[PDB]
Ligand binder design. Sequence first.
Ligand SMILES: CC(=O)N[C@H]1[C@H]([C@H](O)[C@H](O)CO)OC(C(=O)O)=C[C@@H]1O
Length: 516
Amino acid sequence: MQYSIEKLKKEENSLAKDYYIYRLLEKNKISKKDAQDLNSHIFRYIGKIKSELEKIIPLKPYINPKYAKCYTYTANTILDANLTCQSVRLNSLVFIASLNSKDRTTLAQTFKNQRPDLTNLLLAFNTSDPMSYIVQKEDINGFFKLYNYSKKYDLDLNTSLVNKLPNHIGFKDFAQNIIIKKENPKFRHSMLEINPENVSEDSAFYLGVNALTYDKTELAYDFFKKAAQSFKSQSNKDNAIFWMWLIKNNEEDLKTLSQSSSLNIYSLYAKELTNTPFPKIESLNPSKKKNNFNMQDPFAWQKINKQIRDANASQLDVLAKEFDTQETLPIYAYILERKNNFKKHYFIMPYYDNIKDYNKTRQALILAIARQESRFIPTAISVSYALGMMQFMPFLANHIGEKELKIPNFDQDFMFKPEIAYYFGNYHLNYLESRLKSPLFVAYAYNGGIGFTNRMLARNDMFKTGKFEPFLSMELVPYQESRIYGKKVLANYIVYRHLLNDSIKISDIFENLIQN
Ligand SMILES: CC(=O)N[C@H]1[C@H]([C@H](O)[C@H](O)CO)OC(C(=O)O)=C[C@@H]1O
């Protein structure tokens, strides 16, 4: 089914409407005329849909009309500009780097009283190492502007300077990136001297991972303990408490972790080590067959999803009842997950006839992936237009459907059919598992591609033998999305294996991750 640009224009703005506009663009069916009003019809104007629309109608915009005149000067004529224009242009470090040194000296004097930040950057670029100049001034705003301009600067930072960094908004991404990318070794080593009193949440956690890579186990414990105390989500606290346990072996930490209300790999592992029973999994069995809702209409899903997320505690109960049918089971579970404030564990198995003939280990992996990818919503669409319950990128979906399986009249929208999603997921999971084996590694490759996974596993510092392995390696997976995805999918997998009476010990999974 196709939609003309005219029909789409009548739908509400959503990712579904964006997806269908993008299908028109990629088929060259949007004329320069149709493209005129089109911006106000796009829900999320980022990435491919933007670069495609801008092939038809470029934008030069935007320069704020107040400062238009400021952008008529160059490095050769900036001394002719008024003081306001001079200071606007000096917001750009590339602009500052382009100036000649006599003009940087002149402008540094001009701005020393009113804008000593500008002065510091001007004089820093008069040296062969601007980062060293800025660090000597302990100019923290300047430091982050220089880092954003170029990641290549690296220098030792003293105790006073590093303890000032965590107060700046840029600190969190700075610390994450240099620790997981294993860049900027002098910055990295310097961050051993950050007082745990000065950091919290994710930043404290990454500084703990940092301390472990230098085998500073007491500092690491202090960082992870501050993370456990400050993190807002129970899942993240549990990850931090697990590290506290692994490092200092306090049995109260493991007891606290085994009694967590969050189901995650860390609380599951702690339950297993202490002979605690498996957590209770909800049982959803609606007797009603169906209602009026079309589970194959992507526009209906965008609409009802927005109602569910904005619904007060009251309106959730009305929706819960409406969607308490077998045909709408994924929507029911989605509503209940909100309605019970994310306290109960739901692990549904919808459209199960399509998988009941696979072995149970394969069933569990399919279901683990689908739960994480879509929550079993058949018409799910990601911001990069991954499609259906198993969130297939269109390129891969077309390769499998057209080239490999030669399906008659295949269209990428077949990914919205549960039978197609499960079938293709099985097919792709076979390719990955045959090469990768561990369900964790499969999960990383499913989310991030087999290329990145192969490169990570080729490194001699990832998933090898060690004191704190394989846990440390799971913290150092270089893409945040994939690092998180793997932990979540692995927990789902354990749960579904258990529900299918095909249990495995998560300790066996961890042992199989270490190659020799
Ligand atoms: C089965 C499949 O398509 N896997 C792909 C995955 C997926 O679409 C994502 O996990 C959606 O949530 O995305 C990507 C990607 O780098 O974009 C590559 C994977 O090969």
